[PDB]
Amino acid sequence: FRKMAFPSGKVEGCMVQVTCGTTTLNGLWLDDVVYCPRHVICTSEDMLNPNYEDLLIRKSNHNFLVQAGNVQLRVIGHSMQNCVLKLKVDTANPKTPKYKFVRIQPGQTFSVLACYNGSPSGVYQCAMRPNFTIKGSFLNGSCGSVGFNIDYDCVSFCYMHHMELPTGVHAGTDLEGNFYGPFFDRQTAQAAGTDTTITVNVLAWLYAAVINGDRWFLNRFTTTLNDFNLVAMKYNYEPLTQDHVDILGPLSAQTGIAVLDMCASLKELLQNGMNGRTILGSALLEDEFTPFDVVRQCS
Amino acid sequence: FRKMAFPSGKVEGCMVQVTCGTTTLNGLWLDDVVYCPRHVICTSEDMLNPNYEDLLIRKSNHNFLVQAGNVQLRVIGHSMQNCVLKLKVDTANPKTPKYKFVRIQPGQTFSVLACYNGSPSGVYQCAMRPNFTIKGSFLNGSCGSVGFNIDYDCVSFCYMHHMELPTGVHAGTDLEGNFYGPFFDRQTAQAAGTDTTITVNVLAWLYAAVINGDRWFLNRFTTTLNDFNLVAMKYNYEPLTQDHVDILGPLSAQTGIAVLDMCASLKELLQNGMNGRTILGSALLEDEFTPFDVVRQCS
Ligand SMILES: CC(C)(C)c1ccc(N(C(=O)c2c[nH]cn2)[C@@H](C(=O)NC2CCCCC2)c2cccnc2)cc1
Ligand SMILES: CC(C)(C)c1ccc(N(C(=O)c2c[nH]cn2)[C@@H](C(=O)NC2CCCCC2)c2cccnc2)cc1
Numbered sequence: 293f294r295k296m297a298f299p300s301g302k303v304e305g306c307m308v309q310v311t312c313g314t315t316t317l318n319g320l321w322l323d324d325v326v327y328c329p330r331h332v333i334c335t336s337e338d339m340l341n342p343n344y345e346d347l348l349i350r351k352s353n354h355n356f357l358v359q360a361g362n363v364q365l366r367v368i369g370h371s372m373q374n375c376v377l378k379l380k381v382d383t384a385n386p387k388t389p390k391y392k393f394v395r396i397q398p399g400q401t402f403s404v405l406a407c408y409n410g411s412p413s414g415v416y417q418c419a420m421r422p423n424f425t426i427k428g429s430f431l432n433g434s435c436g437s438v439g440f441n442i443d444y445d446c447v448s449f450c451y452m453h454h455m456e457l458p459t460g461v462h463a464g465t466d467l468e469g470n471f472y473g474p475f476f477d478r479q480t481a482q483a484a485g486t487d488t489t490i491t492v493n494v495l496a497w498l499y500a501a502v503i504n505g506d507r508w509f510l511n512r513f514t515t516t517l518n519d520f521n522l523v524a525m526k527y528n529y530e531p532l533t534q535d536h537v538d539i540l541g542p543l544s545a546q547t548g549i550a551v552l553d554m555c556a557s558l559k560e561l562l563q564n565g566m567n568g569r570t571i572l573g574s575a576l577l578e579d580e581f582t583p584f585d586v587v588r589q590c591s
Numbered sequence: 592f593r594k595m596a597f598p599s600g601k602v603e604g605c606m607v608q609v610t611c612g613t614t615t616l617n618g619l620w621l622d623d624v625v626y627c628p629r630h631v632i633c634t635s636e637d638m639l640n641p642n643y644e645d646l647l648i649r650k651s652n653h654n655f656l657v658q659a660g661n662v663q664l665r666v667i668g669h670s671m672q673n674c675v676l677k678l679k680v681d682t683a684n685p686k687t688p689k690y691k692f693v694r695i696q697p698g699q700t701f702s703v704l705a706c707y708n709g710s711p712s713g714v715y716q717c718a719m720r721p722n723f724t725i726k727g728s729f730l731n732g733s734c735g736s737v738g739f740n741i742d743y744d745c746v747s748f749c750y751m752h753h754m755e756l757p758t759g760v761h762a763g764t765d766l767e768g769n770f771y772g773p774f775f776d777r778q779t780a781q782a783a784g785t786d787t788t789i790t791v792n793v794l795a796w797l798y799a800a801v802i803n804g805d806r807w808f809l810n811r812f813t814t815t816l817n818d819f820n821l822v823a824m825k826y827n828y829e830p831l832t833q834d835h836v837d838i839l840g841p842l843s844a845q846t847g848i849a850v851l852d853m854c855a856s857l858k859e860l861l862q863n864g865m866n867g868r869t870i871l872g873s874a875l876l877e878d879e880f881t882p883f884d885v886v887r888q889c890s
Contacts, residue, residue: 293728294594294715294727294728295593295594295715296705296713296714296715296728297596297713297714297715298713298714299599299600299603299704299711299712299713299714300598300599300600300714301598301599301600301601301603301604301711302600304598304600305600405598406595412598412600413598413887414595414596414597414598414887414888415595415596415597415598415599415714416593416594416595416596428593429592429593429595429888431889431890460804505759570875573875574873574874574875575873575874575875576869576872576873576874588712588713589713589728590730591730
């Protein structure tokens with residue numbers, strides 16, 4: 293049972309290189325618009341406290357070099373929507389898929405197509421942390437890489453990568469340019485909140501374990517949501533809601549283990565540890581699989 | 592630091608559905624040939640001890656339904672190469688990429704494009720175990736899914752999925768139809784050998800840990816290859832060769848830690864365990880990252 297990403301083909305045909313002066317990063321080319329982080333227009337003397345409106349005034353269309361594979365797209369307009377730059381180009385991307393722009397919820401997962409110089413390099417599955425960071429694998433110049441989900445034939449873009457925090461986690465925006473979390477595209481001290489564990493996701497992964505025959509942690513007990521949440525909050529776990537219980541229903545039905553029964557199992561795992569046993573080959577509780585992810589991978 | 596797969600777009604345009612009677616699985620459509628496991632021509636009364644030559648004699652071109660997305664390809668010929676069926680169709684795939692067929696080495700990794708009914712569902716990174724099994728995430732009907740690597744603009748196909756063993760690991764062939772390992776496409780008792788740990792890959796992952804700031808396991812000591820291998824063999828680790836040392840050179844140079852110094856660190860980790868510490872967020876030693884994988888993800 294593995295971290296599984298969505299096939300990336302629909303996204304690969306949209307990645308382009310965007311250069312502004314000495315700075316190169318990635319852009320997303322949909323119809324006749326290229327989306328990319330606005331901090332591409334920054335210089336090192338601007339990065340500490342940029343005035344992006346003023347910086348964008350100083351730019352002309354010819355200060356933006358956009359390359360698709362190895363064809364130069366002509367920028368014919370440029371504008372700023374919150375923290376994303378929109379570069380209007382004179383050609384529509386013929387490989388534009390059907391798409392929507394979505395803002396996701398903490399705890400939800402998505403696939404990341406990690407790119408450098410406009411070229412895809414890898415694909416992996418990510419979760420949006422409760423504190424709106426992502427624990428990504430991104431090097432310098434990965435800015436403009438996007439996170440996405442696929443539903444039927446439609447790509448739902450939910451994340452554009454912007455920056456690393458000095459703690460090594462990553463921050464970015466939705467495709468309308470609004471940051472996830474309290475972060476800003478400037479080189480200043482920025483703390484993420486305390487990170488917590490996504491309780492509903494750990495429960496889904498214990499169900500995945502049961503589905504795959506790892507059952508040693510099941511116990512006879514049950515619990516109430518209220519008494520579970522009282523314990524969970526001592527171990528830095530997000531509260532479990534009735535909506536979360538309803539969301540776990542399919543996994544409960546497939547295994548015949550009630551949600552509050554699995555909650556009792558998670559409660560004793562927290563209070564006792566694993567005693568050197570593993571679950572699904574891990575010695576830690578995994579929280580980056582949603583209930584949907586588990587159902588898809590096990591159905 | 593994550594399990595990262597290659598972008599899958601070049602492979603997605605090659606996946607088709609292949610039905611023979613009640614059996615549906617996946618095929619790979621390259622130029623005017625569809626490759627798929629030959630056991631698609633089996634019935635339940637054939638599965639225990641199939642005579643594939645005789646079974647293929649009984650088939651006609653019209654017993655093979657091949658669907659690309661939702662277009663029916665006309666099979667105009669059929670033949671068997673070891674354990675893969677080659678269905679000649681009357682159209683060339685216009686999305687055929689540049690490709691080669693390669694047979695990989697135990698310990699090497701590849702990306703898997705997991706498919707059902709000819710449609711991509713997910714992509715993940717895999718390793719070929721020392722005993723020529725793969726620990727994949729494959730459900731029923733995943734047969735015909737392929738594993739691949741990308742070099743420059745060329746897809747190197749190395750694996751076609753065939754079957755699950757009752758132990759839950761997976762077996763398959765190269766794209767010329769030769770099984771990896773001692774396995775056969777028949778429903779009989781088949782044991783994989785004892786599985787061992789890919790030593791050079793664990794060393795690469797400790798380097799990845801050092802590159803990412805996890806350094807607690809470094810010690811002052813060094814060792815010889817011979818004395819390392821004497822210990823390693825007690826813990827079910829593959830022998831480390833001079834070729835493996837040379838392969839680890841770039842990682843040694845980037846970190847300034849000699850290979851035999853890291854070998855001394857791995858030797859004490861084996862003899863002492865981790866004392867509840869983790870490395871790269873794992874409490875177990877990870878062996879499915881090659882030195883190449885680490886260099887790519889950290890460069
Ligand atoms: C101008 C602004 C907003 C401060 C900025 C500066 C640099 C970048 N980083 C580019 O690599 C990069 C930038 N432009 C082209 N490449 C990197 C980045 O975030 N370092 C941060 C380090 C802490 C202090 C602030 C910046 C980066 C590294 C690894 C993974 N992701 C991104 C992103 C934003
Ligand atoms: C005919 C032959 C060679 C014995 C065979 C039979 C079934 C399949 N399996 C198909 O799912 C399938 C077959 N044809 C269409 N779908 C599955 C499979 O291997 N069960 C094995 C279980 C142990 C005993 C032998 C078969 C499968 C499940 C999960 C992931 N991977 C494959 C593969 C090969």
